[PDB]
Enzyme design. Structure first.
Site: not given
Lengths: 143, 143, 143, 143, 143, 143
Positions: B62, B100, B114
């Site tokens: 990237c 992105e 999480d």
């Protein structure tokens, strides 16, 4: 409020976590992957290992810890027209490594996408899910 | 062999990319999210913005570039029992910002996971896909 | 909700920012600094430059951009019993570099503290403030 | 010359550190904070936790270590016209975490400044200081 | 004192840099490389590209900038019993990319060493040197 | 395929590693170094310490671990017309720190080059090699 849960008083134990992710391929993408900017599967596999180590930097409340093992596999499943990514992470700590396994798979998937989006911008990272984990109060868990 | 494609001779143009991701919730996870370790949706939203900026560090080939805009939204869709993440990134460069946008969504999704895995380790990040992009030779693209 | 403000449509202009910070010294710390783990002032000066470059990674909504100039000075003011840190950052962008200047000073101050806390844990980083900036709609600003 | 002090032969013990920082507000900034680019207090709180984990990368001679706990609080004290930031970090290591606590507070303060500088560029991060620490030869210390 | 030289007033021009490095092999290491922990040459090649992007974070006074091209080659020269690494980096900026080329080669070399040190700890990274660069006042330069 | 070797079941032991690197100077570069952008030797010494801590982020399959000691020395050897860099890293882990020592030396060397390339672009980082290591199955090793 958000906080990195205190686990200072928990013993240091053997932890392991395994996750997987998939990238659904179009015929165009499949052809490309069969022909080999570089080999998407090879670059993605390495990105996954690197990602596992960078997990705590990406997940805000994640506990930083030294990893003792990282395995990543990125395979092409031709008949199913998709790429399967699997990652297993290990360590000795007061918390688990589910996030490290999940992140390794997610980033490897993102890398496969990066390597094939030129011709197929619509490729989808279909799933990212935990398959197994061991260690901790809850004990062993399997999907 | 792998390589960061040379785009030095391409003009600097306005680029934009929008992606989305979903986290499928169990009744247990939904209840938790409705009650609010911190608010999963708030922490994830910020992790997505941070992730967009760290994209080039995570995706091997990237192109590193300065971002001029990053928008991330993490919403709870109660009836559908899932969290929808959407991210739009902008810049002026020789390459696009699809990675992105995709990475911002993936990391925000990983953060939601999480924050809710304690009670629901089986939660799945169902999809991560590009919705739109503009700029570049190929021009505008929509899912 | 939080967001990296879109400045994609703003022209690229010359930006500059200058900030300062202070570390108040005890007689113990002053003596140490006069004797020279390494020279606190030298290590801190470099940490400030490095910090300026890492600013966007530390400040969530900060725009990532290439810096064209970074100057940091860490001086001992014996009579005043304190260390004065000053930093000036420059670039050509759609947003300012006040955060880069402020962060360079803050981290240099934290480094001075790190180098002297062994004997003086109570040392205080008294102030961190912007002194000047130029560029942007608001134009030139001075304290 | 500078060096990361050798602590390889010291036992692994429970360490803790608490620091605080303040941002002095103008009436303009106070009004803004009361109205809520995003909520400065919320974004800053998260930046502090992230900063604690990035401490060794910012402070040159700081020992890298796994953190087992990070708590950050960013509160508005209306009558006093200022924002109070407090951070407590914990771990089990051969060195202390004073730098992690101090850095978490400094970066949270820098983030509050980032979120309010648009209208008030003169805002000052008045102080950053250690309040308490435990563990190590020197033992417990309090301001 | 150290400082990131101000180049804010210099025009944005096409820059390029090419460097190389070598790893001298023992018969033991050569055999291993011919048999293929993973392929040292493949992993090193990717590490070099990643390293080029991380250059400003590693070299204190280095100017951070967006890279528009990165090429890395890691080849086995059997008869000469050594690995040759070559890297070419490009961009449009006010400063050169010699450091990016040099760092890409150095890190790729370090990675080859990492992959072969198990059996050969004495392997030497013999040289790291610039071969060519263009752009800037000094103009084109060749070894 | 590439993988971070599993060492989860190995005991935690005292590890140490020492490496060195050289930068060959031209008369032009030597003169400059004797006159003192900043002192190349001082900046490089710090870059080496910082680099040791960033090793796992640069070397793909390297195990992340907390370092307990880092020493770096960058000396000018006038008669020999070269800069000698030496680094010793220590820790308690399941794997060695040869990579940390090697990387500290390589980056310090790259920094010396960065500080002197203005007048001497042809400067060569002649060697980077391991001098000693202890700990692990293989035991003590010396060049």
């Amino acid at each position: 409020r958000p906080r990195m849960v205190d686990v200072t008083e928990k013993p240091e134990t053997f932890r392991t976590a395994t996750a997987e992710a998939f990238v659904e391929l179009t015929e165009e993408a499949l052809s490309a992957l069969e022909k080999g900017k570089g080999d998407p599967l090879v670059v993605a596999q390495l990105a996954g290992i690197l990602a596992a180590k960078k997990t705590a930097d990406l997940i805000p409340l994640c506990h930083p810890l030294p990893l003792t093992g990282v395995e990543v596999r990125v395979e092409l499943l031709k008949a199913e027209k998709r790429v399967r990514i699997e990652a297993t992470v290990k360590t000795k700590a007061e918390t688990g490594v589910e996030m490290e396994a999940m992140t390794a798979c997610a980033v490897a998937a993102l890398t496969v996408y990066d390597m094939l989006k030129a011709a197929s911008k619509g490729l989808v990272i279909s799933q990212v899910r935990l398959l197994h984990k061991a260690g901790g109060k809850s004990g062993e868990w399997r999907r």
